[PDB]
Scaffold this active site. Structure first.
Site, PDB file in Angstrom:
ATOM      1  N   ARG A   1       3.618   2.328 -10.944  1.00  0.00           N
ATOM      2  CA  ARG A   1       3.892   0.893 -11.114  1.00  0.00           C
ATOM      3  C   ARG A   1       3.900   0.493 -12.585  1.00  0.00           C
ATOM      4  NH1 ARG A   1      -0.434  -1.051  -6.372  1.00  0.00           N
ATOM      5  NH2 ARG A   1       0.266   0.543  -4.856  1.00  0.00           N
ATOM      6  N   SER A   2       2.941   0.999 -13.360  1.00  0.00           N
ATOM      7  CA  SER A   2       2.894   0.666 -14.777  1.00  0.00           C
ATOM      8  C   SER A   2       4.188   1.087 -15.476  1.00  0.00           C
ATOM      9  CB  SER A   2       1.694   1.346 -15.451  1.00  0.00           C
ATOM     10  OG  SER A   2       0.441   0.833 -15.019  1.00  0.00           O
TER      11      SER A   2
ATOM     12  N   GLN B   1       6.725   7.648 -10.575  1.00  0.00           N
ATOM     13  CA  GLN B   1       6.084   8.716  -9.796  1.00  0.00           C
ATOM     14  C   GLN B   1       6.897   9.219  -8.599  1.00  0.00           C
ATOM     15  OE1 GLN B   1       2.183   6.532  -9.211  1.00  0.00           O
ATOM     16  NE2 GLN B   1       1.316   8.572  -9.516  1.00  0.00           N
TER      17      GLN B   1
ATOM     18  N   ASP C   1       0.828  -1.216   0.000  1.00  0.00           N
ATOM     19  CA  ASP C   1       0.000   0.000   0.000  1.00  0.00           C
ATOM     20  C   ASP C   1       0.865   1.270   0.000  1.00  0.00           C
ATOM     21  OD1 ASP C   1      -2.550  -1.304  -0.044  1.00  0.00           O
ATOM     22  OD2 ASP C   1      -3.212  -0.424   1.833  1.00  0.00           O
TER      23      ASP C   1
ATOM     24  N   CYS D   1      -2.316   0.423 -13.510  1.00  0.00           N
ATOM     25  CA  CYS D   1      -2.388   0.436 -12.071  1.00  0.00           C
ATOM     26  C   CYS D   1      -3.540   1.363 -11.717  1.00  0.00           C
ATOM     27  CB  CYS D   1      -1.032   0.843 -11.489  1.00  0.00           C
ATOM     28  SG  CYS D   1      -0.236   2.325 -12.285  1.00  0.00           S
TER      29      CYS D   1
END
Ligand SMILES: NC(=S)Cn1cnc(Cl)c1Cl
Length: 282
Positions: A221-222, A262, A181, A215
């Site tokens: 994440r992508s 990110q 998370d 994502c």
């Protein structure tokens, strides 16, 4: 510089934030006018994440052809990816329309439907064989065929039917279920194992349309997934694998979709994944 020793040099000097901010400063800026039209407000999950006009995927619909999705085309590596946001309640039908029209074999999902107590994307696939889904706005039917649940990820076989023509296709759903998370994984081992399973399936190969990867926003994440894949492929293709420059590859990919990777922690994790993956290759 090479990668593994550039890596230790940034760790010892604690300059990951400064490296990552340089990337952000140099990144391309292109228009995203279609994404910002008022009629498309409920087609975007986040107001600051939009596809560029020059690389956006168009739906084959004459009313409204907009989806928050981008084609990332890597010329030297000879790989293409579609990066998109997690579908919204009012875009699940558009999502599967895109999968159909672009002839994709696989869908890669890097998030859970609920994280941090909030919904990160819609429940867009069926959870029981005998309870199929129908998307009436785009005239598609989707059925769960089989499901294989492992410790870090789940693979599902799905049948997508175009109800207009009665054509059917098999779609593979690769669902990475254990990204934390907060932060990034401590070891890249399970992420790399997952990438290799996607590769082995044929979903990344030229005999199919581009893989669809998402994502929640389709950039973090992508971005890690396609950056690691492309860097490892280039290290196999080139005479000098130490010439592969992950920061340059990332800036090339950011010509096609804004914001890929990110945080500075995601950047460091991408380095770690490529460094460890290269060995396993031989
Ligand atoms: N030296 C390399 S890895 C050349 N390059 C830089 N960005 C991309 Cl994509 C490529 Cl290839």
């Amino acid at each position: 510089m090479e990668m593994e020793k550039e890596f230790e040099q940034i760790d010892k000097s604690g300059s990951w934030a400064a490296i990552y901010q340089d990337i952000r400063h140099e990144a391309s800026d292109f228009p995203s006018r279609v994404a910002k039209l008022p009629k498309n407000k409920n087609r975007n999950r986040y107001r600051d994440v939009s596809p560029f006009d020059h690389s956006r995927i168009k739906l084959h619909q004459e009313d409204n052809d907009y989806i928050n999705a981008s084609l990332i085309k890597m010329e030297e590596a000879q790989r293409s990816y579609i990066l998109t946001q997690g579908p919204l309640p009012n875009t699940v039908g558009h999502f599967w329309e895109m999968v159909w029209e672009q002839k994709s074999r696989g869908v890669v999902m890097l998030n859970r439907v609920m994280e941090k107590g909030s919904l990160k994307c819609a429940q867009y696939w069926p959870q029981k064989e005998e309870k199929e889904m129908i998307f009436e706005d785009t005239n598609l039917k989707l059925t769960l065929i089989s499901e294989d649940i492992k410790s870090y990820y789940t693979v599902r076989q799905l049948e997508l039917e175009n109800l207009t023509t009665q054509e059917t296709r098999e779609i593979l759903h690769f669902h990475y279920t254990t990204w934390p998370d907060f932060g990034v994984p401590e070891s890249p081992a399970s992420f790399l194992n997952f990438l290799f399973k996607v590769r082995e399936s044929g979903s990344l190969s030229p005999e199919h349309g581009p893989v669809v990867v998402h994502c929640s926003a389709g950039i973090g994440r992508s971005g890690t997934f396609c950056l690691a894949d492309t860097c490892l492929l280039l290290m196999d293709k080139r005479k000098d694998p130490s010439s592969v420059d992950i920061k340059k590859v990332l800036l090339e990919m950011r010509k096609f979709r804004m914001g890929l990777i990110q945080t500075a922690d995601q950047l460091r994790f991408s380095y770690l994944a490529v460094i460890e993956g290269a060995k396993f290759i031989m």
